[PDB]
Amino acid sequence: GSSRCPPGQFRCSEPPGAHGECYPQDWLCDGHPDCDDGRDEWGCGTS
Numbered sequence: 687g688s689s690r691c692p693p694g695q696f697r698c699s700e701p702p703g704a705h706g707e708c709y710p711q712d713w714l715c716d717g718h719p720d721c722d723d724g725r726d727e728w729g730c731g732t733s
Contacts, residue, residue, distance in 0.1 A: 701726050 692703020694711035698721040701714030713720055715730030 698722060698726060 689707075690705045691708030692705045692711065694702050694704075694709030694714075696702060698714075701711050703709070704711040704714050704716075706712030714726035716727055717731070719725065719727050719731075
């Protein structure tokens with residue numbers, strides 16, 4: 687399986703590439719927001 691490891695060094699205001707495989711970006715778009723305000727999962731929460 688490819689070595690997934692997208693970028694994710696922002697300030698927690700926009701998930702570039704979610705993939706705990708490398709970066710904690712996974713946190714983003716998961717279920718609950720954990721950023722400045724909570725946009726890392728904005729377009730993720732709502733079904």
